[PDB]
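Example 4.3 (complexes with small molecules)
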Amino acid sequence: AMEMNYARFITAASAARNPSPIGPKSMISLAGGLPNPNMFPFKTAVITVENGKTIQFGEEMMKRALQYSPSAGIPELLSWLKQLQIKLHNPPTIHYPPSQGQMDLCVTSGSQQGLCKVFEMIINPGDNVLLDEPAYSGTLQSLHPLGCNIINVASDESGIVPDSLRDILSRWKPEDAKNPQKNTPKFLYTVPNGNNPTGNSLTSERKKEIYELARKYDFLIIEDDPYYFLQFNKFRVPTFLSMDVDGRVIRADSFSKIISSGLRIGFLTGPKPLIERVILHIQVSTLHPSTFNQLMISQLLHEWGEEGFMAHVDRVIDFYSNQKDAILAAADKWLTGLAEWHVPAAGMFLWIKVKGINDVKELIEEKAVKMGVLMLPGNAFYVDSSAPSPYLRASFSSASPEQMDVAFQVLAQLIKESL
Amino acid sequence: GAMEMNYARFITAASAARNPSPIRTMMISLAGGLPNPNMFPFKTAVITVENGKTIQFGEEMMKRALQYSPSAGIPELLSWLKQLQIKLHNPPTIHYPPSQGQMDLCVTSGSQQGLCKVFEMIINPGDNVLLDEPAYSGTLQSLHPLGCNIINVASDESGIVPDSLRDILSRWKPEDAKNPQKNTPKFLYTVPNGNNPTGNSLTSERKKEIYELARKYDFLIIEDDPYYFLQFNKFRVPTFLSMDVDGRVIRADSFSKIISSGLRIGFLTGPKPLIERVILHIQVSTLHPSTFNQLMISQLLHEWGEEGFMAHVDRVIDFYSNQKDAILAAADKWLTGLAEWHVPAAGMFLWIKVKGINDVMGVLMLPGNAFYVDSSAPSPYLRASFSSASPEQMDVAFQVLAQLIKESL
Ligand SMILES: CC(C)[C@@H](Cc1nnc(NS(=O)(=O)c2cc(F)cc(F)c2)s1)c1cccc(F)c1
Ligand SMILES: CC(C)[C@@H](Cc1nnc(NS(=O)(=O)c2cc(F)cc(F)c2)s1)c1cccc(F)c1
Ligand SMILES: CC(C)[C@@H](Cc1nnc(NS(=O)(=O)c2cc(F)cc(F)c2)s1)c1cccc(F)c1
Ligand SMILES: CC(C)[C@@H](Cc1nnc(NS(=O)(=O)c2cc(F)cc(F)c2)s1)c1cccc(F)c1
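Answer. The structure with MVT bound is encoded below.
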């Protein structure tokens, strides 16, 4: 375990944040001075749940659900998720001292809130960041105003190529990480399972190689992993968090694809000194994630248990895997000869390279639309969105087999008559 | 008439660099990245509402509630709130061109989210900001890491004293507002009704005097108004927004004291170029406020109508006014000649100056220290909460406080 200097990953503004000058701690007991919840108009709730179950908010629970709650999340959700992270990832940092990157969790208002806060905590203008393009548009949109240089790491069907990362890092010496003025990268960001838009996932062996490069040049890994629970291989690949001997990994998990996107509940797992910075920023922004929505999820998860949760996840994977089977069969049918793709390892996107056409934006935004078919041009997933893209992101989250037949029959036509 | 605003002046390099999503460019569509909501385990909901009513999310409505939604908020809530702001405040900027500061509204994940993003949009390190201490601890905690210099404007039982502001601003010539080296204040922040922690509220005439100075030295007014709907006398004071002929007011409204604090639904009203910067920052952080929680509130507001909402607010004001009376009666009984206090005009707090002591359950009592920029400095003040203590609890709590004061003198 290498010693971490967390202060180098914390901006002046982030470091300046202080805890508020304001038995077992609960808002039920400690909210006497906060707004009186008897004034709130919602009184009880029943929410039906799959397999003929319910969640009930009685009068007391409704008052809690409608009241303020801690910035890091409700304690019982944090506690249940801590145990989930232990079971799934057994992170090395569980019992490290706080100052050495003890594993710490924060519930966030979506995972993207967590990620944004992490990026803001770290990045000064002119810092270098590593990621693999095509990358999620939200991440690129988030990094742009922070004024970092984004250095693109090559990727393939197995995600980031370690040799590319190695080749990028050879630009510095390892000892340059001790010299702020050398500007060695502050972090590597990646989506390690079912990258949006590619559908590609890292292997265990590559993750080990990337982790060791992160030690060698002393940078953080931001493991943005919203499709962790949507891997089609039922043996889930070990995560960067699971290898994190140094406490250099910040992991973002999301409920958005398995439980609800609209509830805006995700969570960060990472070293305590960095997670604390994020919590303090949350505390002066959203204050906390919706108490009501946390209680819906926390109650569901407590009633399910870890087995029930994982069973749910399995049923979600089964649905998306059948959808993947269907979209790959339409691709096989119509696009063989006219386009390239890999089988998605996780998530909900098929990434289609159109052969013999430099850009596909006109092909969609005039020709495909007019034929009642829309897919997404690839340009949005690069730092330079004006550069030509031969790629299309096709979602298999919703469309029927019949709809995928039509869309791809229509795409095949337009590819033929555009060559 | 209306002065021309240079909104660029109030937008950092970082905030100005924010761009909209290329997926904004947008029938069998495989283009979207929405997860399939049929996979989500919550299926329907029934939520009981005060005075006998129910709110129902059927199957389709539940799938919407559990799914991503627009960044500024759901259209039904946005339109209801827009019409609320037009009716209450008649903002002079309603029909201005977008670039001249047309009134815009965003639903936020609580009002504080809106305010934080506004502060972040505006402040470079070393900028001057105006506010009245004692101030909301959360605002001070938000401003500290941005590295602004907080200039304290004097205040009293009627809030900010315009003559202090006048005197403070006279340091600059008004032309200095166009000279970045002079570092004229970028904004004035205040809580105009029921200031946390003082309980004091601005008067109509002072608000007009403050606005006049804001125009002359060209600063924004950040109107943080979460106790607007807890005005005890029920004769509403005109807002800074209602006098905002220039589009220099950003207003924060909260549902935290009247509908729910825990749902994290508030709203931000302001000039479109500034509100757009806040929306773009939201788009890369929370994305939007919870769709479920927005729908709860929107369904409620629509079954109530404006009349149901105001009847609700009316009963909430009566409850807090009755609490104010009880805490004041407790204070009269136990604290006269040991302490001093003004009658709160709104909100949830009694601010108590303890006589003789240089520096300071049931009723939460917090030292005054937490409401100043310099929290290490001695404070003879206590902030006492009256949101929930019963009359018996107030009686005991102040009996105890009187004893502690007497034996410490
Ligand atoms: C919503 C606001 C009111 C809270 C949010 C908070 N965030 N973290 C907290 N930590 S705690 O007090 O130790 C705590 C831990 C629990 F597990 C349960 C509990 F009830 C209390 S309280 C707040 C924010 C800023 C200033 C302030 F005084 C209070
Ligand atoms: C979580 C607990 C620990 C807090 C509860 C609080 N009670 N009053 C508070 N006032 S505040 O920070 O100004 C505030 C008022 C609002 F209305 C909203 C808001 F976001 C913040 S915070 C606590 C702190 C100290 C002693 C104690 F008994 C309880
Ligand atoms: C109508 C609006 C509400 C939709 C429109 C969208 N449809 N597909 C998208 N694909 S995406 O950018 O790759 C994406 C995928 C996710 F799975 C999650 C995510 F946050 C973003 S964005 C929306 C949804 C979310 C955020 C947002 F800016 C716009
Ligand atoms: C809670 C009661 C006491 C109300 C009494 C009112 N005072 N002025 C009002 N103006 S209005 O144009 O009739 C009106 C009515 C609506 F139904 C909706 C709307 F947007 C505007 S209604 C109140 C609200 C806020 C602060 C306060 F001091 C008093």
